[PDB]
Design a protein around this ligand. Structure first.
Ligand SMILES: Cc1nn(-c2ccc(Cl)cc2)c2sc(C(=O)NC[C@H]3CCCO3)cc12
Ligand SMILES: [Mg+2]
Ligand SMILES: [Zn+2]
Length: 314
């Protein structure tokens, strides 16, 4: 180091601070963007540059060449977290800031572009190993593995205590990314919020809130500018439809969302998702963390665009 501040071009330097920032098509800039974010979010001091770079590069290696659940997604998810963190400065511990960005970069490690359901149906070994939140348990495993590679311990300066804590933040963060788990998490959060029992001092409560953050960051493509949103959806469905094909191969009619023959149903399917998942998520998040409100606003914006698609206004 250490007088070695990462910098971005002006337009990026500015726009990176906003929720709706798109990380762009230049793959080779993404590590730098992450490092920037970490340094800004955490400090230049939180990690050994050399170690961090090495870690980042290995993580990258371990993301596959799938249409959606790839390295770009990783970095995209991290950036939304960075925005949250940066707009809610004083709310988060030092350990949290460290762990959370890392969690996000690692949260879909070695993803195959297939759902937990498919894995179960196919009878994949991972399904036997991990009976719930299959892929998520895997992602965490892979994170630990990489952390354990020579010269990849970015956590090396932390005490034994602090280290166990950070890894525990990360584990919970990653597990939260299991959407099946989101619904109940949010319901509880909403109830607490409303009955005024929510208490950020209660770890158990903090956990929940971090969970929701996770989901939020994870779905952040719904919070982009429309053409980004629109184009990312293509990627999302490319995976769904491939899975659909695989379901059919196992002799199972897939859900229509995964049936490429039922493309026509996409817009309506987006509507449901926005309504059932996305909108509530950002709403409760805004309740708990008011400065995250732009995420809710952008989501609503995108809902409306899907309404327009349906009305053939595009
Ligand atoms: C519709 C739909 N749109 N998206 C979506 C949109 C935007 C982002 Cl940014 C991320 C996701 C999802 S994720 C999901 C889901 O996971 N369903 C679970 C189902 C499948 C397999 C069996 O159970 C269903 C949808
Ligand atoms: Mg995932
Ligand atoms: Zn993800």
């Amino acid at each position: 180091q250490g007088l070695m501040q990462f910098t971005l071009p002006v337009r990026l330097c500015r726009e990176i601070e906003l929720f709706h920032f798109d990380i762009g098509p230049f793959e080779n800039m993404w590590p730098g963007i992450f490092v920037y974010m970490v340094h800004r979010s955490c400090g230049t001091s939180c990690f050994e540059l050399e170690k961090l770079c090495r870690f980042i590069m290995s993580v990258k290696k371990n993301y596959r060449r799938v249409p959606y659940h790839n390295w770009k997604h990783a970095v995209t998810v991290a950036h939304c977290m960075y925005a949250i963190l940066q707009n809610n400065h004083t709310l988060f511990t030092d350990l949290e800031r460290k762990g959370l960005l890392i969690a996000c970069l690692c949260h879909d490690l070695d993803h195959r572009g297939f759902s937990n359901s498919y894995l179960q149906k196919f009878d994949h070994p991972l399904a036997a190993l991990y009976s719930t939140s299959t892929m998520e348990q895997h992602h965490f495993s892979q994170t630990v593995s990489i952390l354990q590679l020579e010269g990849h311990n970015i956590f090396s300066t932390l005490s034994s205590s602090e280290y166990e804590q950070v890894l525990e933040i990360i584990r919970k963060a990653i597990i939260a990314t299991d959407l099946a788990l989101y619904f109940g998490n949010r319901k509880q959060l909403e109830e607490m919020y409303q009955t005024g029992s929510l208490n950020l001092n209660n770890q158990s409560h903090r956990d929940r809130v971090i969970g929701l953050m996770m989901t939020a960051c994870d779905l952040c493509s719904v919070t982009k500018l429309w053409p980004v949103t629109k184009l990312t959806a293509n990627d999302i469905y490319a995976e769904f439809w491939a899975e659909g094909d695989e379901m059919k191969k196992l002799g199972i009619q897939p859900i229509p969302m995964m049936d490429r023959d039922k493309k026509d149903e996409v817009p309506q399917g987006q509507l449901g998702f926005y309504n059932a998942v996305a909108i509530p998520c950002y709403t409760t998040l805004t309740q708990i963390l008011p400065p995250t409100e732009p995420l809710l606003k952008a989501c609503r914006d995108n809902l409306s665009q899907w309404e327009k698609v349906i009305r053939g206004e595009e």
